[model samples]
Target chain A: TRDQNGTWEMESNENFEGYMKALDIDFATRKIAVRLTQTKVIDQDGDNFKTKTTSTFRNWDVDFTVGVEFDEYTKSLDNRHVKALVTWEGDVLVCVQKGEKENRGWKQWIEGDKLYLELTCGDQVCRQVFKKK
Target chain B: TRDQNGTWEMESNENFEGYMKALDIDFATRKIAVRLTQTKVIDQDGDNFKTKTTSTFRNWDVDFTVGVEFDEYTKSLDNRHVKALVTWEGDVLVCVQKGEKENRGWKQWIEGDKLYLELTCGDQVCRQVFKKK
Candidate 1:
């Protein structure tokens, strides 16, 4: 098993506050989220990697070994309770979530000069373009 | 703004494939998705009634009978681009999407114990469900 982990920074360069506002999140939560410094850390153990998403607002943790399934609690951004499975799709990492709503999930890919993140909830889909820092 | 949209039973869902075969969806996209059936429609003045995504694939449409500002996109399955405007028609939620995607949106309503929706994309469709809240 190998351990490969990295931290991605979300600078307030984008209108993140406006984005969250559109979601109808309460003002107080918005305040917390806008100032959030989200840090994600992963620990590779055999085929399983323990991922911890830490932030000033809240923390989310998942212990998943590749190919194994686990329950994820996204304490931040609505605290979704979902079953997640992440696998290698070609060179990209894909995560599919099954619960509450149909076809809800996220996909991550790297393109020239940017990191792409796509998030979907029901029929509402949001794509975020991030430049590596 | 008081039009009651109705719901119906989904006989046999036309697979995005099975049907895409008649079109030109290629093999890669098809190899990625299967087992999908959908139902969707709209209710508004001009263009704005959004309902989409019930399975591996998503479809949609939307707009405003009450006329308000809103934005939407599908990040669920395909991570396509779209924007939306939503309003109330009586008690129904009406929406409209604007972006690189076209005729991509949906409209939703509740009937007795079942929630009804009508979704459309290109020429394919899919429907979803929930017990109640």
Candidate 2:
């Protein structure tokens, strides 16, 4: 069963640099970011959600409702501004971002005590796994 | 069901100094110990258990099995030497310690997402609560 409302610590990350390059993020930021252990704290109440992505260097927070579209500033992640809409597909939380980059979005879902996240930008997809902390 | 295999962070503590006095711990040690936030992590497999109590100042680890008496050194807590046995009473994990300091023991149980601990020493008992982290 999917349980999305918990603190999750990073287990592993893949293709992070390619995904960052899709967003035109420089090499220095991508290098340090991928090496850091990222923690995700998801505060969810029914359809409302606040996802805080935290690392040693920076943090990014996104607050939104399941079916409503809102402005999303990636903040320290990419500093990109986009319109974001989150929706539930089965038990998966899927977000679609409308911006200059093509096919930019992310999907998050819980599997047992692990959370699987797929981040996409332009043509690259980065897969990250997290264990419940 | 009783699930003791998780990370539990401190929620509250009561009468900690009174319990410390019963342990014959120093006044200086009692002052800092009672104020520190203690986190307990339980790693259990069937009847075997490894309970790690961590704080900012010190950490204590006790490993034992149900129905088996084992020699334990309370390294950082009181530095007392005792024979300890842990057993399950209903759903509660009860520990009885045999030492010069008579009536020294503790009781632990899981309630919902909270872990309840009662530390007994001599005539004093300290109650502590922890929520799943």
Candidate 3:
């Protein structure tokens, strides 16, 4: 089983623009966002987890417990509200966000020392990799 | 002179949260962003360049010319506005973003097969490394 409780640094990113566009980000914001470097800090306690995505331009934080659904507000980034739930499938951490957007959610998994995250908004999906620090 | 005209994949990240917090992003967005992977595609023609940062969750694209200042809007990333200029100092591609925030801007450099980007906002700085694909 993968225990995700540590500071993870970004190692790879795929299709960031498509994913952001799916959320209807503006032109100006996308320009600046395309350049910032992002870092992730995650704290996991059994089925409960907290995550933060940080960068020079902005930061986003989230908290959730497994099985139980919660109200999630996506501020600063996308500025949307959703009902969110997180669950585990094998060693992966999966999140389903119910909102105005279609097919919204994320999946996280670990491979050796690397962490993999798949972010989905509508039909667009972005994949990112991180390494433990 | 380093010509940034290729597809680069992420390799490493540092201090992303610290930087993001400086920009005042909300909690939930940061959580989802921390896990997304971002890919950078840069097309450079001498002093003119177009760059796109893409991912499943979001995407950002920018167009700039070296030594020429332009109005840049950080839409989905920071939701801010800035006057941005890019120039070459040695082999480094340096950008100075003049905006409402203090100490804002970024620097990019290439080392052998690796590309380095330094993002700055307020007093926070984040570093990212990418490999040529």
Candidate 4:
């Protein structure tokens, strides 16, 4: 789901506050995110993977098993709460979060190692990515 | 607490499988992250920090710290679950997560605002960073 400007849009925008508030993020963080740029990258090695997120202000990384539960500490961002369980739905990877906010989750897919991500917070959704080297 | 080499290693690394298995990532993602490189950068002026992780295929970031919880969207890492609370453990920033994995946490240290981080999954350890510009 997106807007007329050809930008990939999210499903829930109203929940932004509720979600951000839960994280206890200051107005500054919210200001940054309002017009923030998100970049994502995924690496593939046969059946293994490594992914990263980058922006003008911060950077982070995550590594996991193809079919398992991984301890995820989202050290920064909003600091809300959750223990994510990423599963597969065919070729698409679906993340089911169990934490503070409701209707929070994400979906990931690979197009020949060029990864795609869809994030949701309540009704607001966001998409981002990075291609292989 | 690290080893003789001063490496900040994880204490309980057994649950790595239970953690990653839940992600249901492709075999390829697991392989890459297993040997993946992790980089962290923190920007600070007194109490705030901007942290980032970068690698060949991916990059991520989070801005927070020093007492207070915030709504964090670990959009790229596992996509499984979370909202995090990052507080300062003395000068060492500590992150306590309310999620599926037990004893899941992160410690951050700053040398003149040049941030350092250690991420553990099962027994896999990823350590890295960036300098201020």
Stretches of candidate 1 off by over 4 Å are: A1-63, B1-133
Give me the displacement of residue A54 in model 4, in angstroms. 14
Docking model 4 quality class = incorrect
Q: What residue pairs clash in candidate 2, if any at all?
A: none
lDDT scores in order:
0.43, 0.57, 0.59, 0.44
Alpha-carbon deviation at B86 in model 3, angstroms: 0.7
Candidate 1 lDDT over residue span A1-133, tens digit each? 0222333332322344544444444565445445444333434343333434334321333345445567876543344578977665764547787766566676655566444546666555545444433
Error of 3 at A17 (Å): 20
Q: Which of 1 and 3 is the better model by TM-score?
A: 3
Model 4 interface Cα RMSD in Å? 22.4
Q: Highest TM-score, which number?
A: 3
- Give the Cα error of residue A116 in candidate 3, in Å: 22
- Provide the lowest-lDDT 10-residue window in model 2 chain B: B52-61
- CAPRI level of candidate 3: incorrect
The best-first sequence of candidates by lDDT reads 3, 2, 4, 1
Q: After superposition, how far is residue B84 of candidate 4 from its true place, in Å?
A: 42
Docking class of 1: incorrect
Q: What does candidate 4's lDDT look like per residue over A1-133, in tens digits? A: 0001111212113333334434444555454443323342334232232334454323344554444655556543344457777666776768766676566677756555444556665655545443433
Per-candidate clashes come to 35, 0, 40, 66
Per-candidate DockQ vs. reference = 0.01, 0.02, 0.04, 0.05
Model 3 residue-pair collision total: 40
- Per-residue C-alpha lDDT of model 2 across residues A61-90, encoded as one tens digit per residue: 334656778887754235568898877787
TM-score of predicted model 1?
A: 0.31
